[PDB]
Amino acid sequence: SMSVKKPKRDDSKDLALCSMILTEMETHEDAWPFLLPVNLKLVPGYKKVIKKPMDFSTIREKLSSGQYPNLETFALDVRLVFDNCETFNEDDSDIGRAGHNMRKYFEKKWTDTFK
């Protein structure tokens, strides 16, 4: 509350560390479904069904232009990518599997880097 703060966590490396994590996600072999925005003219159903499209390139632009107020807002956009993936793709599909792998991969890096 007012004049009563928890001890100050060092957040000065978060920008750089999120950038590294994102680079590792960009370079994973199963990143291909997630590198670029889904083409909303060419994928029937996507515009209507997925209220908040998200992809790695869009996360990268947001990151680089100071549009993440903190590391939690960044984690939320990464997760949204995989949540979208699950909404539109059967588990038993290459893309469905890609998303499950990439989520696991992200969550490990997140824990090992920050928790």
UniProtKB/Swiss-Prot annotation:
Localization per record: Nucleus
Residues in Bromo domain copies: 9-113
Free-text tissue specificity from the UniProt record: Expressed at varying levels in several tissues, whereas a smaller transcript was expressed specifically in testis.
Residues in the signal sequence: none
Known partners and oligomeric status: Component of the BRF-1 ISWI chromatin remodeling complex, at least composed of SMARCA1 and BAZ2B, which regulates the spacing of histone octamers on the DNA template to facilitate access to DNA. Within the BRF-1 ISWI chromatin remodeling complex interacts with SMARCA1; the interaction is direct. Component of the BRF-5 ISWI chromatin remodeling complex, at least composed of SMARCA5/SNF2H and BAZ2B, which regulates the spacing of histone octamers on the DNA template to facilitate access to DNA.
Its job: Regulatory subunit of the ATP-dependent BRF-1 and BRF-5 ISWI chromatin remodeling complexes, which form ordered nucleosome arrays on chromatin and facilitate access to DNA during DNA-templated processes such as DNA replication, transcription, and repair. Both complexes regulate the spacing of nucleosomes along the chromatin and have the ability to slide mononucleosomes to the center of a DNA template. The BRF-1 ISWI chromatin remodeling complex has a lower ATP hydrolysis rate than the BRF-5 ISWI chromatin remodeling complex.
UniProt record similarity statement: Belongs to the WAL family.
Name of the protein in its database record: Bromodomain adjacent to zinc finger domain protein 2B
Native source species: Homo sapiens
Species lineage: Eukaryota, Metazoa, Chordata, Craniata, Vertebrata
